[PDB]
Amino acid sequence: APKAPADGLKMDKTKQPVVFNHSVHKAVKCGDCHHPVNGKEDYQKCATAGCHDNMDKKDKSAKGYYHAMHDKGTKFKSCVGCHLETAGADAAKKKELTGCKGSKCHS
Ligand code: HEM
Ligand code: HEM
Ligand code: HEM
Ligand code: HEM
Numbered sequence: 001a002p003k004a005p006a007d008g009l010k011m012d013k014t015k016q017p018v019v020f021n022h023s024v025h026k027a028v029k030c031g032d033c034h035h036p037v038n039g040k041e042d043y044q045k046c047a048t049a050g051c052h053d054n055m056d057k058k059d060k061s062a063k064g065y066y067h068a069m070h071d072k073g074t075k076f077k078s079c080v081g082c083h084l085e086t087a088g089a090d091a092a093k094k095k096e097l098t099g100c101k102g103s104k105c106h107s
Contacts, residue, residue: 004022004023007022008021013065014065028082035076037051047065052064052065053065080098
């Protein structure tokens with residue numbers, strides 16, 4: 001099977017890069033993130049050409065990179081969407097896990 005990479009990976013397609021740590025996410029199935037495409041979990045980088053390669057942050061299509069990391073109501077939970085559910089009503093966790101600045105994603 002594909003193996004989880006080391007912690008400390010940088011997502012740096014944008015001027016607001018974010019560090020992603022697989023170990024913290026080990027209770028999430030791999031294929032919730034590396035989701036099926038044409039019936040097979042796809043482990044390519046998310047912004048591979050033909051994937052989430054649209055770097056317009058207002059785009060809401062299946063190519064919109066920002067959309068795939070931030071929005072609710074998506075077919076697979078996004079970073080922010082899952083974090084909102086995790087934080088629940090806890091305001092401190094909302095800031096830490098979902099804040100647009102001063103959060104664990106963005107300084
Ligand atoms: C589950 C144990 C699991 C596996 C296996 C896995 C693999 C994996 C690989 C091989 C990479 C590197 C891709 C590359 O070629 O650079 C990678 C990268 C990311 N992953 Fe992952 N991953 C597993 C689990 C999870 C889970 C549960 C999530 C979502 C909460 C997730 C997310 C990511 C992200 C984001 C990246 C970086 C990709 C990018 O920036 O394009 N992974 N993973
Ligand atoms: C990389 C780990 C990665 C992430 C993160 C990601 C997220 C993502 C979301 C949140 C959706 C749902 C969007 C919605 O509006 O419903 C989604 C959907 C699709 N993706 Fe994706 N995706 C990641 C990786 C990849 C890769 C590597 C590809 C291209 C091979 C890709 C493609 C697509 C496609 C197509 C969709 C729509 C799927 C469907 O409707 O069944 N994603 N992704
Ligand atoms: C989407 C690519 C994504 C990112 C980015 C991300 C980041 C992230 C950070 C920065 C933390 C805090 C710990 C750390 O520094 O690593 C964190 C914590 C949790 N996450 Fe996450 N996360 C992304 C995606 C997802 C998805 C899609 C889910 C749920 C399906 C998820 C869940 C969690 C959980 C649970 C934690 C731990 C929360 C806590 O309070 O410690 N993340 N993630
Ligand atoms: C709060 C809802 C919030 C905002 C607003 C926000 C903005 C933001 C911007 C402007 C970018 C850059 C987009 C571009 O193309 O210029 C960006 C990028 C990423 N973000 Fe974000 N972001 C908000 C919150 C969060 C949170 C809480 C997380 C982590 C759960 C997160 C994650 C990401 C990821 C991943 C990226 C892409 C990093 C990269 O590849 O450079 N955002 N965000």
